[PDB]
Amino acid sequence: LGSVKPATCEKPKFLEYKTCVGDLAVVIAKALDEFKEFCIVNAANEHMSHGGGVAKAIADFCGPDFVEYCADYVKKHGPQQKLVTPSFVKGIQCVNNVVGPRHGDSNLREKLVAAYKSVLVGGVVNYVVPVLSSGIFGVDFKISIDAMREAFKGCAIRVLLFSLSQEHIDYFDATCK
Amino acid sequence: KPKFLEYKTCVGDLAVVIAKALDEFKEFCIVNAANEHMSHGGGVAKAIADFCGPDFVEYCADYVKKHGPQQKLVTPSFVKGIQCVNNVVGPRHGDSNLREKLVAAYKSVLVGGVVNYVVPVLSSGIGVDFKISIDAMREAFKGCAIRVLLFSLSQEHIDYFDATC
């Protein structure tokens, strides 16, 4: 519960997508120049451990404050399927730690759509989003990306989709064809 | 994205280097010859900080305040066409084995998702021999499928590289 301070930038007229392939630092570098402020989506686990993958890069980036926040929170409240936290980085309004579904889970598409829908944070119009469930969680990046387009359709936000893999971003461009 | 390593050169001040890079590359990473505390008061570091501005300066300051000194730090540039700044700490003054230090420095210029780079001669300012820096760069970039624009105020440095090609 509670709201994050609303962004000082304005919502776009329609849904806008951007992409970035590369290391987290590259992605944030793009986002800080394109977005006045933004939410970064973390591909988390329910323990908010951040031991591997992009969760590890985001944890290392945001630093000790962020690791400590998640740690104190899970100890106090237990495991979370979603946790909107501070980032402790100027320009980064919050980190939205979303736990997506895993390979083989029943009702996969519905669970993917719901995860992306949960990305949204009141007062935030710009988002930096990974391919949820496509790392350790083992879901086909294509179905995750289709889930995203379905979740965000009609939505007045800006979304920077990012990945280490050019294939993932090439596939996104093919969704725009 | 190139088939294999390509080199370009530029003698000039930062404004002329960047103008050329924007034309040749469209988009690229600029390498800063930084110190570990990311203090950009002098040399190309000053040129870059002054070009990219207060957000860049504060970004670097804030990061070192949180995480300690860095030997490599990739940051926003806050400039269209410049994908990021990669601040790379070369050796000084000295410093045992330059080179291997210089080789390790140049290798660290590489960032996932960037293929075009605008690179100074590391450790050439206020100072290590430039021929060893340039030799080190050649060794580090061998086999890399990237584009490198090497730049300097000194015609002397560019000439040594051009003979090297």
Q: What is the DSSP string of A33-98?
A: HH-SSEEEEEE--TT----SHHHHHHHHHH-HHHHHHHHHHHHHH---SEEEE---STTEEEEEEE
Read off φ and ψ for residue A85, nearest 5 degrees: -120, 170
Number of domains in chain A: 1
- A112 with A140: CB under 8 angstroms? no
Q: Is B84 on the interface with A (CB under 8 A)?
A: yes
CB neighbour list of residue B35: distance below 8 Å, 6 or more residues apart: B45, B89
**C-alpha span between B103 and B107 (Å, rounded):** 6
Size of interface A-B (CB pairs under 8 A): 53
- A69 with B116: CB under 8 angstroms? no
Please give the C-alpha separations between residue A88 and each of A39, B64, B100, in angstroms, as whole numbers. Answer: 12, 14, 36
What residues of A are in contact with residue B59 (Cβ under 8 Å)?
A: 32, 90
**C-alpha span between B63 and A78 (Å, rounded):** 31
**C-alpha span between A88 and A105 (Å, rounded):** 34
Length of chain A: 177
Q: How close A162 comes to chain B (CA, Å)?
A: 11
Domain holding B88: CATH number? 3.40.220.10
**C-alpha span between A32 and A58 (Å, rounded):** 15
Q: Is B144 on the interface with A (CB under 8 A)?
A: no
What residues of B are in contact with residue A26 (Cβ under 8 Å)?
A: 74, 83-84, 111-114
Q: Token pair for residue B9?
A: 């050169």
Q: Is A28 on the interface with B (CB under 8 A)?
A: yes
Please give the C-alpha separations between residue B130 and each of B48, B80, B95, B106, in angstroms, as whole numbers. Answer: 20, 31, 15, 13
**DSSP states of A3-44 as a string?**
-PPPPSSPPPSS-EEEEEES-HHHHHHHHHHH-SSEEEEEE-
**C-alpha span between A101 and A138 (Å, rounded):** 9
**C-alpha span between B89 and B128 (Å, rounded):** 13
Length of chain B: 165
Q: How close B160 comes to chain A (CA, Å)?
A: 32
**C-alpha span between A120 and A46 (Å, rounded):** 18
A29 contacts B84? CB cut-off 8 A: yes
- B138 with B56: CB under 8 angstroms? no
Q: ∠ CA B114-B118-B121 to the nearest 5 degrees?
A: 130
**C-alpha span between A65 and B142 (Å, rounded):** 40
- A128 with B76: CB under 8 angstroms? no
A26 contacts B74? CB cut-off 8 A: yes
CB neighbour list of residue B82: distance below 8 Å, 6 or more residues apart: B18, B27, B28, B29, B30, B52
What residues of B are in contact with residue A23 (Cβ under 8 Å)?
A: 74, 111-113
According to DSSP, the β-strands at A92-98 and A82-85 are antiparallel
- A5 with A147: CB under 8 angstroms? no
Residue labelled with tokens 């990974």? A130
**What letter represents residue B22's amino acid?**
L
Q: To which H or E segment does residue B64 belong?
A: helix B54-67
- B150 with B158: CB under 8 angstroms? yes
Residue labelled with tokens 């951007």? A18
**C-alpha span between B65 and B67 (Å, rounded):** 6
- B85 with B30: CB under 8 angstroms? yes
Residue of B nearest to A22 (CA): B113
Please give the C-alpha separations between residue A136 and each of A82, A100, A148, in angstroms, as whole numbers. Answer: 17, 11, 18
Cα–Cα nearest to A64, from A81, A84, A78, A50:
A50
**C-alpha span between B123 and B144 (Å, rounded):** 22
Helix (H, G, I), strand (E, B) or coil at B30: strand
- A162 with A21: CB under 8 angstroms? yes
- A133 with A101: CB under 8 angstroms? yes
Q: ∠ CA A123-A127-A131 to the nearest 5 degrees?
A: 140
Cα–Cα nearest to B160, from B105, B122, B123, B121:
B121
Containing structural domain, residue A143 = 1-177
- B157 with B134: CB under 8 angstroms? yes
**C-alpha span between A161 and A158 (Å, rounded):** 10
- B14 with B120: CB under 8 angstroms? no
Q: To which H or E segment does residue A173 belong?
A: helix A166-175
**C-alpha span between B68 and B137 (Å, rounded):** 27
Q: Token pair for residue A148?
A: 């995203």
Q: How was this structure determined?
A: X-ray
CB neighbour list of residue B105: distance below 8 Å, 6 or more residues apart: B88, B89, B90, B91, B122, B123, B136, B140
Q: ∠ CA A33-A171-A145 to the nearest 5 degrees?
A: 80
